[PDB]
């Protein structure tokens, strides 16, 4: 009865941008992972630190489900030890990450004839994000010697750029919905067990 709400995470009507990635906390529910096995509609399925087969018979204190949208050329960056605009400025996974990364082509949903520009990504940042950090600040990036007092112009750019998602985009530039499941095991009662 108390099945973990993986449906409202994967089958969510609308997803968030990668800079403002949404996190769902999974606690106090039997974890039915059979929605990942049966659904062959997945393009990228890679796990780290844990194996998916030996996962339905293992308990965890908490499970975190992070979801966002990126393009195909950036899906490879959702992994430990990766660099790039997404890995460094939007969503970073630690080197000892223990979980699974799932993504599928969502060109049918996240594309408009005039270009879907609702999905954004951070372009500049003064430093790289720490693991599992969510930066949504829109401070004007200072790229030159002249300081920006919140105004844009010469070497003063807005930090967020919008994706260009069209139906005729190349596969590398088509939208992909990513779900990142992360598993933690602390010295605390384990509320999430598989079955």
């Amino acid at each position, epitope marked *: 009865t108390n099945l973990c709400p993986f449906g409202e995470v994967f089958n969510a009507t609308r997803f968030a941008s990668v800079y403002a990635w949404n996190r769902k906390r999974i606690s106090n529910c039997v974890a039915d992972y059979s929605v990942l096995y049966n659904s062959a509609s997945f393009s990228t399925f*890679k796990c780290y630190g844990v194996s998916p087969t030996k996962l339905n018979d293992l308990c965890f204190t908490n499970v975190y489900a992070d979801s966002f949208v990126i393009r195909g050329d950036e899906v490879r960056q959702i992994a430990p030890g990766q660099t790039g605009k997404i890995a460094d400025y939007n969503y970073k996974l630690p080197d000892d990450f223990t979980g699974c990364v799932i993504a599928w082509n969502s060109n049918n949903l996240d594309s408009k004839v005039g270009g879907n520009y609702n999905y954004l990504y951070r372009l500049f940042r003064k430093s790289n994000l720490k693991p599992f950090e969510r930066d949504i600040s829109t401070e004007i990036y200072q790229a030159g010697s002249t300081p920006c007092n919140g105004v844009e112009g010469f070497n003063c750019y807005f930090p967020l750029q919008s994706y260009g998602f069209q139906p005729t985009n190349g596969v590398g530039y088509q939208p992909y919905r990513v779900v990142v499941l992360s598993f933690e095991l602390l010295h605390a009662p384990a509320t999430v067990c598989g079955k």
Partner: antibody
Amino acid sequence: EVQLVESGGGVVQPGRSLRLSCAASAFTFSSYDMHWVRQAPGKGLEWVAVISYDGSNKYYADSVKGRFTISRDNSKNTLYLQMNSLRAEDTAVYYCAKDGGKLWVYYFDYWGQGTLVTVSS
Amino acid sequence: DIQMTQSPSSLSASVGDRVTITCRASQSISSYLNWYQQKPGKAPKLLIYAASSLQSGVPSRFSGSGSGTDFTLTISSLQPEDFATYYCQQSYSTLALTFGGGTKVEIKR
């Protein structure tokens, strides 16, 4: 005393299909995840696929995904690997390997002797 | 993907020498590094799993070590039945298991 015996390898033209089979013995075969591993002539080892102990999870490498299929028959204590749309890159010696399951991750406990699969036109 | 660089490509040593083989990974793997042995023609055989856990039925002269990226496999005293090519295989990338190049140990003369 754990034995694995591969069979079904031969010579095949590109684009054709071939069906490999492993034969497990002297261990509870239906309670372990099983792997396939290939080795091209002269090259190194390359992991191929994985099927869960109950035969419900199937995972593949990017080099063979959507092209191979791994299955198992616990009643017959066998591990199957159907190789559809064979290319020249698939020319290798294929092994079946028991997992072990002592870690959260996959390792290779015991190896079969392998069967030769050659793809040429 | 994760590349496993194994050096040296091939070493020469005689019987009784302290043989050591290095395995380096492109990124961090906690301790999911495995060591295999393969005689010419024969099938691979597991020696060390998870950095430094000796497999049942493997002589005590084999020992692993290392954590992170730089791993090591050490044979305290080499024996004649140990002349083979040794591979290392990372596991941290579960659904993308990759092997090293190998380190064939030849007979020094």
